[PDB]
Amino acid sequence: TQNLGVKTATVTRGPLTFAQSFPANVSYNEYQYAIVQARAAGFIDKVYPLTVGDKVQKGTPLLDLTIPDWVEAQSEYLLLRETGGTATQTEGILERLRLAGMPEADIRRLIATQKIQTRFTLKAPIDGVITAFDLRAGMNIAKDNVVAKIQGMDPVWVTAAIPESIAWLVKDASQFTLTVPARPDKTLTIRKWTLLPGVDAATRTLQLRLEVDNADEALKPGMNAWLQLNTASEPMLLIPSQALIDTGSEQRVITVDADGRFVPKRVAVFQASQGVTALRSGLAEGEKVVSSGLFLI
Ligand SMILES: [Ag+]
């Protein structure tokens, strides 16, 4: 017999979810930078109040290079304007200067002020941080030289390493939980996600690129981060773990009959996890099973 107090569950067919944890490295994304490089070749000036580790916005100062060749060309052009000159010829000369590297705004300014144009302070393009920033004091610059570069933070990248098989299992962003030791947030969005086929033969792991959402600012490189990644399995018959009993080779449980009448069924488990058990053999889909309750022999 089995007096009332029950509770019930019904076998259903599904995959089992396996949760795994990996350690991510927080990194600055490569494409989100800005390289301030210089057209023409030039000497440096002023050099500003910057130290290589600073916040910058729209590049608003940075430094100034005064240049030789352009000035000579401008002077020749000015002389042509003063005398009398083919307007077209003057235009061609201007075009050559523009080609050399003249900023267009600067050329317009020179035309407006018939002032030999000579000194430009260049401003960095993006609101940003600077990755490399150390040259100073009037030095030669050439061709297109790095005036250096600026790092941006709208995005961030957290890297986790996965086994190849587990990685193939991946698919969808939802089975992704990201968390951090320093600065736990309301949470962190995962905005993009990618597997870089490059197999860390050091080990047999693929590299997972994760683009975190850095719009408010609480993110840095080499901070520490845990990627709790969710996974799954070919589908199996699933019972709600609690109702299942063995303590020996006896291994199983009770089947209802809509009659409210019980019975023993000998099931095989396969695996257990997270909160449910998956049987290899034993029960049929939809069969009823019990998840709470007690009764007497
Ligand atoms: Ag299975």
CA 174/CA 193 separation, integer angstroms: 11
Same domain, 37 and 145: yes
Same domain, 128 and 43: yes
- Tell me the CA–centroid distance for residue 194 and ligand 1, in Å: 28
| 101, 121 contact by CB (below 8 A) | no
- Tell me the CA–centroid distance for residue 236 and ligand 1, in Å: 6
- Tokens for 109? 């300014």
Same domain, 123 and 180: no
DSSP assignment of 111-141 equals HHHT----EEEE--SSSEEEEE----SS---
- Tell me the CA–centroid distance for residue 239 and ligand 1, in Å: 13
- Tell me the CA–centroid distance for residue 161 and ligand 1, in Å: 26
* Total count of domains within the chain: 4
Q: Which domain-ending residue is among 151, 171, 205?
A: 151
- Tell me the CA–centroid distance for residue 291 and ligand 1, in Å: 22
- Tell me the CA–centroid distance for residue 243 and ligand 1, in Å: 20
- Tell me the CA–centroid distance for residue 14 and ligand 1, in Å: 10
CA 293/CA 254 separation, integer angstroms: 11
Q: Which domain-ending residue is among 203, 235, 267?
A: 235
Neighbours of ion ligand 1 (CB under 5 A): 236
Same domain, 229 and 248: no
Q: The domain that contains 90 carries what CATH number?
A: 6.10.140.730
Same domain, 88 and 188: no
- Tell me the CA–centroid distance for residue 279 and ligand 1, in Å: 8
- Tell me the CA–centroid distance for residue 16 and ligand 1, in Å: 9
CA 8/CA 181 separation, integer angstroms: 40
- Tell me the CA–centroid distance for residue 211 and ligand 1, in Å: 33
Buried b (16+ CB within 10 A) or exposed e, 179-207: ebeeeeeeebebeeeeeeeeeeeeeebbb
Buried b (16+ CB within 10 A) or exposed e, 99-116: eebbeeebbeebbeeeee
DSSP assignment of 36-68 equals EEEES----B---S--SS-EESTT---EEEE-H
- Tell me the CA–centroid distance for residue 234 and ligand 1, in Å: 6
Give the CB-side neighbour count of residue 156, counting CA atoms within 13 A: 21
Q: The domain that contains 189 carries what CATH number?
A: 2.40.30.170
From the list 204, 192, 219, the residue with the least C-alpha distance to 168 is 204
Q: Which domain holds residue 138?
A: 33-66+118-151
- Tell me the CA–centroid distance for residue 204 and ligand 1, in Å: 25
- Tokens for 23? 């350690």
| 242, 272 contact by CB (below 8 A) | no
Give the CB-side neighbour count of residue 111, counting CA atoms within 13 A: 14
CA 231/CA 122 separation, integer angstroms: 51
- Tell me the CA–centroid distance for residue 203 and ligand 1, in Å: 27
